[PDB]
Design a binder for this molecule. Structure first.
Ligand SMILES: [Zn+2]
Ligand SMILES: [Zn+2]
Ligand SMILES: [Zn+2]
Ligand SMILES: [Zn+2]
Ligand SMILES: [Zn+2]
Length: 304
């Protein structure tokens, strides 16, 4: 049984992607953008009412296997879209005028592993030459100052950058999709946990994006909007100085492709539960995060 207020295993999420699509044909279509190391289909939902020359926002969850609230949020976003379309003015305008690409779980193999073997697994489940240590950090595997800072060259490490940029089937699939759709995708949003932050480029070097003032102001306003619901306090800024320097991130890579609105969300909490955020917090976390995501979406729509 699927529930939006519990953490769902991969079999359940996969079945949900099929069911939510079948139940909402006028608003949702599903494709597979590739396969994981272990051969699992990487599903992508396109959410929106069909129309001509629509701009798009791309959102992914589940880069890091143990960050279960991330996976839960992508599902919640789709929940909100199908529930409130036609009833709530903003969501209806969003879905009429733009498409949302929602990738519910990128690192499917790692996610399965957190359910079956090791709740605290982070990386992919691919093999590495010359060692029995498993996995690459998908958010150190993109072609963005690749493997230079905040990333490890040791395959046994949690931030292992991989053998080469896009060495992982999952990151290659994501990068390929974005490159193939670069004329339509106007914003890139990537959902992580934890630490309550909205980050934007750059993480791979201490340098700032050309539109730094715009991104800073947008992140500041989105943080303020998020806080209105339950008073949850987020920080924001360029990745390198807000959390830490880290090379090979998808947000930096997306920005360097020309996607001007590129953000990483780090959801609840600030360390009390960390990655093992209780199910009792899914609803509140997702509802407040919705406010930030809708704020960014409205901004993108209004500044095309
Ligand atoms: Zn359900
Ligand atoms: Zn399957
Ligand atoms: Zn993460
Ligand atoms: Zn993180
Ligand atoms: Zn709601």
């Amino acid at each position: 049984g699927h529930s939006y207020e519990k953490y769902n295993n991969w079999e359940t999420i996969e079945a949900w992607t099929k069911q939510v699509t079948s139940e909402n044909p006028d608003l949702i279509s599903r494709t597979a953008i590739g396969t994981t190391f272990l051969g699992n289909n990487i599903y992508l939902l396109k959410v929106g009412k069909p129309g001509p020359n629509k701009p798009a926002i791309f959102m992914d969850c589940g880069f890091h296997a143990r960050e279960w609230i991330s996976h839960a949020f992508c599902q919640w976003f789709v929940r909100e879209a199908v529930l409130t379309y036609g009833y709530e003015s903003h969501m209806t305008e969003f879905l009429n005028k733009l498409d949302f690409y929602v990738l519910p779980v990128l690192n499917i193999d790692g996610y399965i592993y957190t359910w079956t073997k090791n709740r605290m697994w982070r990386k992919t489940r691919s093999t590495n030459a010359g060692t029995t240590c498993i996995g690459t950090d998908p958010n150190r595997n993109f072609d963005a100052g690749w493997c230079t800072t905040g990333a490890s060259t040791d395959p046994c490490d949690e931030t292992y950058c991989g053998s080469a940029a896009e060495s992982e089937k999952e990151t290659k699939a994501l990068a390929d999709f974005i490159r193939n759709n670069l004329s339509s995708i106007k914003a890139y949003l990537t959902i992580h946990s934890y630490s309550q932050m909205i980050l934007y480029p750059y993480s791979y070097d201490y340098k700032l994006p050309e539109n730094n003032a715009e991104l800073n102001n947008l992140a500041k306003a989105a943080v303020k909007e998020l806080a209105t619901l339950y008073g949850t306090k987020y920080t924001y800024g360029p990745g390198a100085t807000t959390i830490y320097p880290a090379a090979g991130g998808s947000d930096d890579w997306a920005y360097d492709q020309g996607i001007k609105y590129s953000f990483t969300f780090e959801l609840r909490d600030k360390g009390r539960y960390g990655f093992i955020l209780p199910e009792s917090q899914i609803q509140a976390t997702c509802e407040e995060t919705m406010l930030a995501i809708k704020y960014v979406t409205n901004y993108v729509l209004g500044h095309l």
